[PDB]
Amino acid sequence: SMQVFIKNRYGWTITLEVSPTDTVENVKQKIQDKEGFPPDKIRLIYGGKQMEDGRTLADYNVQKDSTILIVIRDVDG
């Protein structure tokens, strides 16, 4: 019960109904379900910070109407 926007380099967005308790990986799993984007090729960025797979949206202060950027990357850290 929280709405977030995932934007790409072209400005195209996905809207996800998500729970604050979800991990970043869970969110990548939801993107794989809707887009076919393999989670291990997704990098998510919130307020300039790359989001780590094992932390939750609540941990990152992601709130209703927050925008997360998505880019294609295979090696993180």
Map residue 6 onto helix, strand or coil.
strand
Question: How remote is the C-alpha of 63 from its chain's centroid?
Answer: 12
CA neighbor of 43 nearest in space, from 33, 32, 35, 51 = 51
Q: Give me the DSSP letters along 33-65.
A: HHH---GGGEEEEETTEEPPTTSBTTTTT--TT
Ordered domains of the chain (ranges, CATH):
3-72 (3.10.20.90)
Q: 58: which 2 tokens? A: 């609540």
What's the reported resolution, in angstroms, to a tenth?
Answer: 1.3
Q: Which residues pair with 6 in a beta bridge?
A: 14, 68
Determination approach = X-ray
